[PDB]
């Protein structure tokens, strides 16, 4: 084992999570939007069946979006605000970053 | 064109999109779930009630959106699967 909550480890996991949360949200939004076309086309049953499934899922989308950010932020509050702070050699190239 | 409400080439692949989006969340959740225990420490340990409430809260809305996605793709996927096929051939009737 490397660390327990070490901002290094957390950041290592958080940074990896943010991607999951984002992607997860990206996919969710995709469905929420995509479903739009579905609910926009149906013929009884498949309509309410889907339309409804869209409602339940939609309402759940937010629930998840909440636990996503909340969790994604839970790390921030954990004390993970300094990990990729390796801009030491940033201003370096920066100077040579122009014309 | 007259109405982007739902393009045929859209609603058609829409379902297919739901499927891919469905699985995406299926794995995604499994992906984040891993960070949950790995981030548990962020909640002040993994054996803390704090992280716990997060775990259940994660799986909570999780399966909620996961199921909704399945049930959604279950009646959506049929779009280009059954819905397209023919009426009465939709999952509603066909197992």
From Swiss-Prot, chain A:
Forms a tight 1:1 complex with EsxA (ESAT-6). Its main location: secreted. This is ESAT-6-like protein EsxB. Residues 90-99 have a biased composition (Polar residues). Residues 80-99 are annotated as: Disordered. InterPro entries: ESAT-6-like_sf, T7SS_ESAT-6-like. It comes from Mycobacterium bovis (strain ATCC BAA-935 / AF2122/97). Residues 48-85 form a coiled coil. GO terms for cellular component: extracellular region. Keywords: Chaperone, Coiled coil, Secreted, Virulence. It is found in: Secreted. Pfam families: WXG100. Belongs to the WXG100 family. CFP-10 subfamily. A secreted protein. Acts as a strong host T-cell antigen. Involved in translocation of bacteria from the host (human) phagolysosome to the host cytoplasm. Might serve as a chaperone to prevent uncontrolled membrane lysis by its partner EsxA.
From Swiss-Prot, chain B:
GO terms for cellular component: cytoplasm; cytosol; extracellular region; host cell endoplasmic reticulum; host cell plasma membrane; host cell surface; peptidoglycan-based cell wall; plasma membrane. Changing residue 67 to L: Reduced liposome disruption. The modification N-acetylthreonine is found at residue 2. Disruption phenotype: Bacteria no longer translocate from the phagolysosome to the cytosol of host (human) cells; bacteria replicate only in host phagolysosome rather than cytoplasm, decreased apoptosis of infected host (human) dendritic cells. Bacteria missing the RD1 locus do not gain access to host (human) cytoplasm; complementation with the RD1 locus restores access, but if EsxA is missing the last 12 residues cytoplasmic access is not restored although truncated EsxA is secreted by bacteria. The chain crosses the membrane at residues 11-43, 49-85. Keywords: Acetylation, Apoptosis, Cell wall, Coiled coil, Host cell membrane, Host cytoplasm, Host endoplasmic reticulum, Host membrane, Membrane, Secreted, Transmembrane, Transmembrane helix, Virulence. Residues 8-39, 56-87 form a coiled coil. InterPro entries: ESAT-6-like_sf, T7SS_ESAT-6-like. Changing residue 58 to C: Cannot be overproduced and purified. It is found in: Secreted; Secreted, Cell wall; Host cell surface; Host cytoplasm. Its main location: secreted. Changing residue 94 to Q: Does not restore virulence in an esxA deletion strain, wild-type secretion of EsxA and EsxB. Partially inhibits host TLR2-signaling. Changing residue 21 to C: Cannot be overproduced and purified. Induction: Constitutively expressed in culture (at protein level). Up-regulated in infected human pneumonocytes. Zinc increases secreted levels of this protein; 0.5 mM Zn(2+), the physiological concentration in macrophages, induces 6-fold more secreted protein. Part of the esxB-esxA operon. The keyword Membrane applies. Upon purification from strain ATCC 27294 a C-terminally truncated peptide (missing residues 85-95) has been found; it is not clear if this is physiologically relevant. An additional unknown modification on peptide Thr-86-Ala-95 has also been seen. Genes esxA and esxB are part of RD1 (part of a 15-gene locus known as ESX-1), a section of DNA deleted in the M.bovis BCG strain used for vaccination. Deletion of this region is thought to be largely responsible for the attenuation of BCG, and esxA and esxB in particular are very important in this effect. Secretion of EspA, EsxA and EsxB is mutually dependent. May be secreted as a 4 coiled-coil complex with EsxB. This is 6 kDa early secretory antigenic target. It comes from Mycobacterium tuberculosis (strain ATCC 25618 / H37Rv). The gene is esxA.
